[PDB]
Design a protein around this ligand. Structure first.
Ligand SMILES: [Ba+2]
Ligand SMILES: [Ba+2]
Ligand SMILES: [Ba+2]
Ligand SMILES: [Ba+2]
Ligand SMILES: [Ba+2]
Ligand SMILES: [Ba+2]
Ligand SMILES: [Ba+2]
Ligand SMILES: [Ba+2]
Ligand SMILES: [Ba+2]
Ligand SMILES: [Ba+2]
Ligand SMILES: [Ba+2]
Ligand SMILES: [Ba+2]
Lengths: 307, 307, 307, 307, 307
């Protein structure tokens, strides 16, 4: 069992794809294991850069292939390097940019708790062992929070476990097990933009739609309600175009639905008030006075929902 | 005829392209056939990783090229590996991400039954035989259903058949036939988002468009109907922008068309009511009382259509 | 002059880009020419797969480079293979996906007659001759027509010609001429989606815009006409966003323009009716009765245009 | 100083990016210089195709690297070829597709005069000389003009100059100078689509906005003006979505601004007419009669602007 | 410690991605260090072009890998060249296009002060020293300012520093330190397009929304206010579609919010005026006369905000 020390440097996280549940990571990966002592030019360690590494591999140098389990496609590998010390240790350093996968729940969307994971694991080697994992996130989490889209909470996280693959080749007994490094980074979305540019005017619009009951004539009350409907549709459009695509409804979508339902309910009451009648036209006092009931009645449901 | 055992591990299915009828698959492929016994270092099997495999092929090692028939372009091949046992068996393991093709009917779109297929088959070898196919979909179908976009039903499916190519080279008689592995996975789309964020408010809008008959003045009835038309167009826009592009109409599109037709019909009746007349202005009782007939008359067609 | 037999298998055609006049083709290409007899292992023909082909070329094996003339960029070349028979024939088989160019007229757009062309021709060799071209389109043209976006008419088409390049190097006399294979596939667009989801509601909207003349008050007639204008703009938007981008106007765009012109004309008549007058207000009978003339007067132009 | 004859064949120009000031070119490049006589197989010139060229370079064959100065990124290089004549001449032929840069002024946008430039120049060689440049644009400029987006005027253009680089290595005196080929192609945009589908209905809308003064009641005049404002915004949207993105205003944008300004001015006059008054309500005759002044007053500015 | 002289030529800066905080740079990089004297053919320096450089590296020629620290992915490397002088100096010249990262604050967006940075640094070598950095931005900053999107202020900027990496391998004492070149270019966005096509009509719209108080009837005042709301939503859409996506609100977004708030406030006052009353209907003089207060009251906040 060969001991391998992994260090991962995270430069940037970006390009979140909500539909594909995918996010981009750029950084460095460093792997250090101790092999057989060697004779370098002078005593000083040897530096082997990109194209030459292959040449060394062809001469029988041993370089385990480490795979990102949760990666999508194949990473963009930048400059890579081998460092060979005379005392036998070997240090592989490479730069990568890759698209990674993980389970992501956006149902809370404006206010989101997401976590970005990297899963590393040897491709072909069951007994080679990951000694320890060190993650340098040092690119500052809090410098400007309201600039960066996501606010990163705490410094990384680490797990080194043994994954067992049940379905395998003819020889079971001693190796189903591969060592896996899991690095998770917790992050929270910045609600500002969505609160001010979406939630707020949406609220204003809903509240304003309640003002239909302060109209005098029935005709006015109806004809206006249609304009309201149109406004909600237009808003639904404005949101849907900018907002990220999802298989499910977010909080904002629910607000929109609440808008539609509020207006349709208003329509029903407005028509009901007219044709529930003394002779044919009598309009209900308390009902036309629902201008108080409707806003809080909505607010009741509003306070009930997140709860 | 060489026996080849194939195992395919499906990690993720995503990136469905409705227009191109294409979907992305990420996973592993494992091929195992038994060759001539060999002498490995020690007794233990030999592990040959990525770049080295080519070197082994150049030395006369035999590695059949397996082709995905239904793939689009060429797959993104990750880490690949050969495992050479002294008793002669050879196991090829590779990681891939690829875009695959298949016939897809979206006419039911909000509620969709689709099936994702992989078609494997040797490129150049007519007699080499696929022994058996095993598909590990083990990445959990039901864990969170309402998170994942598609709900996968059952565990995979398998067929191993012999495909005959009629048009071929000068020598017909014994080999037109190649062994083909076909893996199909049945899946059903999650209607939630579309029901709540599309179907529902669309319904509310249609129903509301029926309220035009509860207006008193002819002018009101018309002028309002135009606002309704506008609203339906705006909605058609909001849907069309978000929804996937298709060569054909879905259920929702039909609903939209139903909206247009309902409103235009309403216009016709509204004008007809005015100018079918006692003197010139007489409005038809039963017709202005169509407020009952129109909703169910639509509903009749609605219940007739899916039927 | 070397005789070369080409067979092309078309798997899929897709990704039409209207602006770039480009379309994607995936399939196989097979080239067969007869060289000098060879000694294979056993008698059986030799199979040389991807990476090895280059190695054979470096040993002086002759492999003409065939170029797609109308290709854009360079194709995605999948698995490729050489088959070497002892009697001297050589068969090159490769899989490709590529973007191809051709002249495309979309002026009829909803109903389109387009043709997809492949142009093959030796890169460096003036005397090497393409014996015959065979195109297997066998992937079924008619299975489900209303699923596939394009309906393919007939089985392919073929031409083998000699192209002469006037401008050339210092030596003219005997070779300006290269053999070119041209494969054309005629296809017709499926109008369904565009008829129902675009043409139809657009028509309904136009017809409805004629109902403005059934209004009583001048004010109503005007104020409504503006809402109509807005509706046409909104519709123009909804179409333009979904529909493919073009340098020219399609049929639908013309319909839109017809809408604008109809409404503006309506405005002119509505204002004219008011201020062409007995004293100042007199409205013209026949003119307010143009509710008959306008629809057919439009229809006249409509029946005149395609004609 | 080595004489090099360059011939460039332009197949297609497309993919204009207004923001990046970039355009795509596909074609062939041919370079011919005369080296030392050689012994070919037979007397006939030698054909060296793609992969082999490198092999020849490694044997000390001399192949100058020609760089496109104005290219963006690196070109997609298709099939390439060397032709070696026994009398010593060498002809390099390659196919390329590349994104090129040039200064582009879109301020006139609907009617545009643009020019597409290619700048070629040896990478490392100060004394090697470009003998002459020949550009075959022969792909027909005028066949169908209203199909192609751009109308190409005249056949190419050519310049061969000497560029001097001031800032250089330690040795100045005799070589700051590299030979540069510049190929420019003048082209004019097709205004049709923009005239009919944009300019025209925009005009109709503006003209129609002048009809607000033919309304009787002040309320009507205002309430309608708002609908007009909305219509102009909607139109601004429809244009902005389809039209290419720019750092500056085009002609159409100016028209839009003119729309806004016209309507706001109308608002100001409408309110002014009401509250500039005999008692409080008196409306100005000449002002309500500005229905004549406003259209030409706008037209005055319109005829003044391009002038 | 090897002295390395770097010169960087900036051709173009473009493709700013606001969300990813990324921008494209195209140009040349030149690195000059003095090695061991060599014997060239003749006395004249040797020119080694693209593919050959690798061959020289394989023979033990030393070519430090320089990394762009702030690059995203890996650059598109064009033609590259080595120049070997007999006196031992070596000059590496390469052309590159790459996407680079940097902190970008768009909160001021229409008027933006941004700075484009390049960070260069040896990949594997702690003692090799960057002698000096020279940046040729010579592509003209001021030629046409209103054409180019960004106005570049001053000629570049330069820093050469020593970066210390705390976390490292087992040997600390003398080398934590790598030499880093930092090149920063200050630029300011061109407000024209946004002022005229966005800020201005937005202002006109706001001002116009104040005209609601000049209406007589309460009904008019309300029903109109809704149309205003719709107009602001439509405008919010038109802006949001064209404008760049951000995690935060810009100035324009704030203006939009101000619009919504202004209209909602107007609604509140309009309803309050009606139902704060003598009997039930009395409308407040000063309140209906707020037509003066509202515009400046807004303007007060407007002048307070940037301040
Ligand atoms: Ba790479
Ligand atoms: Ba790959
Ligand atoms: Ba099919
Ligand atoms: Ba899962
Ligand atoms: Ba490939
Ligand atoms: Ba879009
Ligand atoms: Ba290439
Ligand atoms: Ba042509
Ligand atoms: Ba050598
Ligand atoms: Ba390169
Ligand atoms: Ba930062
Ligand atoms: Ba320039």
């Amino acid at each position: 069992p060969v001991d391998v020390s992994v260090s991962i440097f995270i430069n940037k996280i970006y390009g979140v794809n909500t539909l594909e549940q995918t996010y981009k990571v750029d950084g460095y990966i460093v792997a250090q294991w101790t092999g057989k002592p060697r004779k370098t030019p002078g005593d000083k360690p040897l530096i082997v850069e990109n194209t030459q590494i292959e040449r060394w591999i062809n001469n029988g140098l041993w370089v385990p292939a480490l795979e990102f389990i949760n990666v999508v496609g194949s990473p963009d590998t930048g400059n890579k390097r081998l460092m060979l010390f005379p005392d036998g240790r070997v240090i592989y350093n490479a730069r990568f940019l890759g698209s990674f996968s993980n389970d992501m729940d956006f149902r809370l969307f404006p206010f989101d708790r997401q976590q970005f994971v990297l899963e590393l694991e040897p491709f072909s080697y069951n007994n080679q062992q990951l000694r320890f994992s060190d993650i340098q996130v040092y690119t500052e989490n809090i410098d400007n929070e309201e600039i960066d889209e996501w606010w990163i909470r705490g410094k990384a996280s680490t797990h080194i476990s043994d994954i067992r693959y049940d379905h395998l080749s003819s020889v079971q007994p001693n190796q189903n097990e591969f060592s896996r490094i899991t690095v998770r980074i917790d992050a929270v979305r910045n609600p500002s933009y969505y609160l001010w540019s979406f939630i707020l005017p949406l609220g204003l619009i809903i509240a304003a739609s309640w003002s239909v009951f302060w109209l005098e004539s029935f005709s006015e009350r109806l004809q206006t309600s249609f304009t309201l409907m149109l406004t909600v549709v237009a808003y639904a459009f404005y949101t849907s175009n900018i907002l990220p695509r999802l298989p499910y409804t977010t909080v904002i979508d629910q607000m929109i639905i609440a808008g539609y339902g509020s207006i349709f309910a208003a329509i029903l009451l407005i028509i009901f008030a007219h044709h529930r009648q003394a002779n044919g036209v009598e309009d209900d006092l308390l009902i036309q006075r629902c201008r108080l009931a409707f806003p809080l009645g909505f607010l009741a449901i509003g306070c009930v929902l997140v709860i």
